[PDB]
């Protein structure tokens, strides 16, 4: 029945401390080992923690590991952080049925960028889909940081309520941040508004654009 | 160099049957436990199942109980993990993981393999133009499984092809644009390469402005 559970999300500036908590469920921390694995986007994870406090060679003492007995609990402090040390990050252990417990994971972004707005580019069905009588609206984000934007869809001013598809932001290849969002359609639907709307915001910032069947 | 490859992962129907195997080289297989970690994309980690250093004693997670088996072959060092009753939530990247000891840490993984359990059947993508320094580019939509790549190569100021999206049908679809001069519209032929091998697909569009 043990069970281990890890902040959603945890931010900082390079150069800071922070601190991802593994809070035991159902059982003792203290019982077993806890190991921490820093996993990329793309790859499988590595150690950074095991055995509560020891290091594997090569990983840098930024990377603690500690155990609250008290609270039953396990620590992951990472001080002097850099953007390198972007990733996800998971504890584990074991309970009494010998069984691999694993941590939800904690998402640790490093914010080394200045705030940049999203580039919103808004492309109407093409003739060719209508043709196969479909339409679907693409409105495409790009170039915002942090990743961090909601998407908002209006037909004739009133917000869209089905039908949309939108991506988990990601990072490019400039270290800025994308994401699409597709409104789905009928020909019938398209055709019966006078204008759609992709409303993207950003930190508190709405970048839209318009499309208006022809 | 340590070394764990999987193999053995693709696409099956809700209730179908898929095997796993795990080559392992360079160290002594037969001395380590063996450990079988999956994550779902886009989610946590989640251990699947482990067998001990000589297969004496197997254990697995409560959801995959009656329906998993892993076994291993120390003589011509593999791991398998034999898959009943699939269901759409087994659907990860199943990792290959030596621990150092029953109690160790996962020091050694794998590559993974993609086992995808999904009633949608693989589907070809319909390819749209996104006609329009302007932005043009092609839609590529409904189609499974993945990847697709998007090439244009008719010169561009910039390139852009978008992570696909998952829809609600369980149909993924991918945007990619690129950024060109708003007067050479009307003059260059601007042409996506679009490429689905796991349909056979392959899609050369022109892209012009509407």
């Known amino acids: 029945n043990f069970m281990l559970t890890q902040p959603h999300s945890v931010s900082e500036s390079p150069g800071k401390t922070v601190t991802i908590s593994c809070t035991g469920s159902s059982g003792s921390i203290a019982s077993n080992y806890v190991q921490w694995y820093q996993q990329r986007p793309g790859s499988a994870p590595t150690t950074v923690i095991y055995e509560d406090n020891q290091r594997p060679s090569g990983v840098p003492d930024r990377f603690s590991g500690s155990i609250d007995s008290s609270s039953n609990s396990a620590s992951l402090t990472i001080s002097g952080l850099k953007t390198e040390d972007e990733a996800d990050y998971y504890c584990?252990?074991?309970?009494?049925?010998?069984?691999?417990?694993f941590g939800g994971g904690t998402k640790l972004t490093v914010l080394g960028q200045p705030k940049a707005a999203p580039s919103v580019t808004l492309f109407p069905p093409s003739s060719e889909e209508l043709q196969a009588n479909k339409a679907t609206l693409v409105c495409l984000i790009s170039d915002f940081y942090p990743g961090a934007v909601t998407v908002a869809w209006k037909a004739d001013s009133s917000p869209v309520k089905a039908g949309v598809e939108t991506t988990t932001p990601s990072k490019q290849s400039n270290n800025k941040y994308a994401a699409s969002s597709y409104l789905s359609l009928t020909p019938e639907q398209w055709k019966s508004h006078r204008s759609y709307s992709c409303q993207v915001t950003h930190e508190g910032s709405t970048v839209e654009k318009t499309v208006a069947p022809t | 160099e340590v070394q764990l490859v999987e193999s053995g992962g693709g696409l099956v129907q809700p209730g179908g049957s898929l095997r796993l195997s795990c080559a392992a080289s360079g160290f002594t297989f037969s001395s380590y436990w063996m450990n079988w970690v999956r994550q779902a994309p886009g989610k946590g980690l989640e251990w699947v199942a482990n067998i001990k250093q000589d297969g004496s004693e197997k254990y697995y997670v409560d959801s995959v109980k009656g329906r998993f088996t892993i076994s291993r072959d120390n003589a011509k060092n593999s791991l398998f993990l034999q898959m009943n009753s699939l269901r759409a939530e087994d659907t990860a990247v199943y990792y290959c993981?030596?621990?150092?000891?029953?109690?160790?840490?996962?020091?050694?993984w794998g590559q993974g393999t993609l086992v995808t359990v999904s009633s949608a059947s693989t589907k070809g993508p319909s390819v749209f133009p996104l006609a329009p320094t302007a932005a043009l580019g092609c839609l590529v939509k409904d189609y499974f499984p993945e990847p697709v790549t998007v090439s244009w190569n008719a010169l561009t100021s910039g390139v852009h092809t978008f992570p696909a999206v998952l829809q609600s049908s369980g149909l993924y679809s991918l945007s990619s644009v690129v950024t060109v001069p708003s007067s050479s519209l009307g003059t260059q032929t601007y042409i996506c390469n679009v490429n689905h091998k796991p349909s056979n697909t392959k899609v050369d569009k022109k892209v012009e402005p509407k």
């Open positions: 584990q252990s074991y309970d009494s049925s010998n069984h691999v417990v």
């Open positions: 993981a030596r621990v150092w000891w029953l109690r160790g840490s996962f020091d050694y």
